[PDB]
């Protein structure tokens, strides 16, 4: 799910409170479509609502579908609201709080998002951007290894409970480590920013369980998204619960902090992209990956056969058997294609499309092999003496919604096993009434 889908399902009060922070308004604005952004900018300095027809006349007739989609999205996000214009007309005006906060974030005003940074002076134990990136990568690899279950990764029990609630891994027997399900494999195959966003959404959906303010967490996350890389910020000025949440971020590698009591924290590149190549693919079904970490090697080996492992290179061959095994593990072909496209080497970016069509088509065809046969358990009826009697029973089954397949030519029909009892009673009752 995207950010807009999550925001649209929130209550109007939550949306109104979210707009109170300038950082949140910018994040919402940058998620809007291109047409919506122009409307927002035009209505930035309007103190009066505009007629719906007047706004509708800005876009041409052919692009009316996009206009309707953008208007519906804006209404769902509650950026603007309909006003009863005098004379029976309907006026459209942006939310005053959201508009004011957006203007403050753009034009200026109020206090800065962060409290201050020069009060404590220079950092005694400051790091560098490559060091922060390495720390974030190490944390993410540790998390993904703990998803696999290797003993090399040791995380807090709360993280394991969160993963269990996320459905990636289930602890059937207490004490023993949880077993990763098919959804866990699908999530592991997902891209790193996508994995971060999914994890954050799962956290937010269960945020109320810990008694934490959703609005504050969202505002802090959006503020972190727009933060400048390599620059620290003051921990002070935040509620304790948020601080606890920040600790979880320290576990996830999004935010670097030397000590729990330290007043400084350095956002990482992963945190920046939270709001939103080394693999070469050849026409002979060969992958040449410029990677060294065991994570990428395992990910590639999930859907391909490894051949050679040079110290800075991995040569693998994509075969039918490997792709079939990966699909049987629960990973779909679209996920594999998206993973290959995301990790595509910059050299392949010249090609249009980046991945050769033959390989993607072959992978999709290999995916279609598994679902060649379709299975539907049910009960077969073939003892219809009269067409009219068959029609009535078929209509009753369709009313019950338990029909699976019908053949009026030969008076043949199939119903679900659960609905067989109702059909049997109905057929017996009709004969009794006869």
């Amino acid at each position: 799910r995207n950010l807009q889908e999550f925001l649209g399902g929130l209550s109007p009060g939550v949306l109104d409170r979210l707009y109170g922070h300038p950082a949140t308004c910018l994040a919402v604005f940058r998620e809007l479509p291109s047409l919506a952004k122009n409307w927002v900018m035009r209505m930035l300095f309007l103190e009066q609502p505009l007629p719906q027809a007047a706004v509708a006349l800005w876009v041409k007739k052919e692009f009316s579908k996009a206009q309707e989609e953008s208007t519906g999205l804006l209404s769902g996000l509650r950026i603007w609201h309909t006003q009863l214009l005098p004379g029976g007309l309907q006026g459209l005006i942006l939310n005053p709080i959201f508009r004011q906060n957006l203007r403050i974030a753009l034009l200026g005003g109020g206090k800065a998002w962060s409290d201050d940074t020069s009060q404590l002076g220079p950092d005694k134990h400051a790091r560098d951007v490559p060091s922060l990136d390495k720390y974030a990568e190490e944390r993410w690899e540790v998390v993904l290894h703990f998803m696999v279950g290797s003993p090399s990764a040791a995380v807090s029990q709360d993280l394991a409970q969160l993963l269990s609630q996320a459905g990636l891994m289930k602890s059937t027997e207490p004490g023993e480590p949880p077993c990763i399900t098919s959804a866990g494999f699908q999530f592991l195959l997902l891209d790193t920013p996508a994995q971060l966003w999914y994890f954050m959404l799962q956290y937010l959906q269960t945020a109320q369980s810990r008694g934490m303010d959703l609005v504050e967490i969202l505002s802090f996350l959006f503020q972190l998204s727009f933060s400048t890389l390599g620059k620290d910020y003051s921990v002070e000025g935040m509620s304790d619960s948020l601080l606890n949440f920040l600790q979880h971020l320290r576990e996830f590698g999004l935010v670097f902090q030397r000590k729990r009591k330290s007043r400084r924290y350095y956002p990482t590149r992963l945190a920046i992209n939270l709001s939103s190549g080394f693999i070469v693919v050849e026409t002979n079904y060969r992958l040449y990956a410029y990677t060294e970490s065991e994570l990428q090697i395992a990910l590639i080996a999930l859907f391909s056969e490894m051949l050679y492992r040079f110290p800075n290179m991995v040569v693998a061959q994509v075969t039918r058997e490997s792709v079939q095994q990966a699909i049987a593990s629960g990973i779909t072909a679209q996920q594999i294609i998206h993973f290959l496209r995301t990790r595509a080497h910059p050299v392949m970016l010249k090609q249009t499309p980046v991945l050769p069509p033959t390989i993607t088509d072959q992978i999709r065809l290999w995916e279609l092999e598994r679902d060649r046969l379709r299975f539907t358990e049910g009960v077969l009826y073939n003892q219809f003496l009269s067409q009219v009697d068959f029609e009535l029973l078929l209509a009753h089954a369709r009313e019950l919604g338990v029909l699976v397949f019908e053949n009026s030519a030969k008076r043949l029909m199939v119903v679900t096993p659960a609905g067989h009892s109702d059909v049997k009673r109905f057929w017996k009752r009709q004969k009794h009434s006869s």
Binding site: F45, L46, L107, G108
Partner: protein, 154 residues
């Protein structure tokens, strides 16, 4: 352009922008935005939507055929006039005068009843204006050439 007042204005603006501070409220106002939208709204000054609304069906085609005939006649007469121009021989001098007389007679005979019919039907289009512009231009050119001819004899 002007005197040292230009340098004085340059120094004044240099001093004024020497101490420059960004502003937010003064940049735009609700009244200014509303006026700009009204100007840019359909039917506004920049968005003039009329532009001869139904000129395809305005000024009925009976008049349109007559207008096209007048256009063809004026074009032919002006083509003859400009072919005569420039006048390099005394023979052409009388020919241009005859062409001017024919133009005036044609105007009085056709355009004046045409103008009367347009005024009676109150057509909003200035169809006659372009025809007058070409005829006025031709008359001005002929008058200028005659003035030059008089000056050459001085």
């Amino acid at each position: 352009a002007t005197s040292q007042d230009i340098i004085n204005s340059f120094q004044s603006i240099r001093q004024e922008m020497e101490a420059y501070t960004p502003k937010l409220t003064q940049v735009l106002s609700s009244s200014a935005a509303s006026s700009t939208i009204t100007a840019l709204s359909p039917g506004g000054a920049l968005m003039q939507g009329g532009t001869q609304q139904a000129i395809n069906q305005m000024v009925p085609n009976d008049i349109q055929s007559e207008l096209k005939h007048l256009y063809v006649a004026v074009g032919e007469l002006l083509r003859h006039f400009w072919s005569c121009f420039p006048v390099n021989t005394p023979f052409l001098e009388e020919k241009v005068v005859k062409m001017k007389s024919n133009l005036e007679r044609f105007q009085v005979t056709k355009l004046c009843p045409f103008q009367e019919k347009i005024r009676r039907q109150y057509l909003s289009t200035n169809l006659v204006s372009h025809i007058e512009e070409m005829l006025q231009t031709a008359y001005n050119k002929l008058h200028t050439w005659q003035s030059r001819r008089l000056m050459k004899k001085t």
